[PDB]
From TrEMBL:
Span of domain GAF: 6-121
SUPFAM superfamilies on file: GAF domain-like
Phylogenetic classification of the source organism: Bacteria, Bacillati, Bacillota, Bacilli, Bacillales
Coiled-coil ranges from the UniProt annotation: none
Source organism per UniProt: Staphylococcus aureus
Gene3D superfamilies: 3.30.450.40
Protein name in UniProt: GAF domain-containing protein
Superkingdom as given in the UniProt entry: Bacteria
C-alpha cells in the first residue's frame, strides 16, 4: 500500500480487532547501523515511544524482524522475565499487559512489525490462527 495509508489502516484495524493499542516498527534508516523504531502508533497514551531505540534482533520488534514468526504474549507479568521486559520498552512506555506482534512481508523479507496491545489486564480478544493472520493483516504484505 502507499506510505500515505499506513496510519488510517492501522487505526481502523486496531478498532475492529478491539485492542487498546497498536503500532508498527521499521528500521529508522538505510544506514548499516540503523536502529529499529516504532514509526506509527494508535491508541497511545503518550509520545515516549519516540525515544525507543531497538538494536537489531532485540525486543519484540527485533525478534519478529529477525525470525519471521509472530509472538503472542497472553500476560506480560507471567510470560516474561525482567531481562525480556527491558529489551521491549514499548511494554513500559505504554503500560501493556498483553501483546500480539506480527511480521509484515515484502518479497519474503520482514520489512516491518505490527504490534497490538492491551492494558489493565484485558485479555487478547482472540488468538488468531495462520489464516486469520493472513486475512486480517495481509493488506500490509506483497
Ligand atoms: Cl519494544
Amino acid at each position: 500500500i502507499e506510505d500515505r495509508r499506513f496510519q488510517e489502516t492501522l487505526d481502523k484495524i486496531r478498532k475492529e480487532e478491539g485492542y487498546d493499542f497498536a503500532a508498527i516498527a521499521f528500521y529508522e534508516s538505510n544506514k548499516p547501523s540503523s536502529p529499529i523504531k516504532w514509526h506509527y502508533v494508535s491508541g497511545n497514551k503518550n509520545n515516549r515511544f519516540k525515544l525507543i531505540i531497538l538494536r537489531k534482533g532485540r525486543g519484540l520488534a527485533g525478534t519478529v524482524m529477525k525470525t519471521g514468526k509472530r509472538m503472542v504474549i497472553a500476560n506480560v507479568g507471567l510470560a516474561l522475565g525482567p531481562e525480556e521486559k527491558i529489551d521491549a520498552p514499548i511494554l513500559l512506555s505504554e503500560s501493556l499487559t498483553a501483546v500480539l506482534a506480527v511480521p509484515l512481508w515484502y518479497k519474503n523479507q520482514v520489512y516491518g512489525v505490527l504490534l497490538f496491545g492491551q492494558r489493565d489486564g484485558r485479555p487478547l480478544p482472540k488468538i488468531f490462527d495462520n489464516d486469520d493472520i493472513q486475512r486480517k493483516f495481509g493488506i500490509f504484505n506483497d
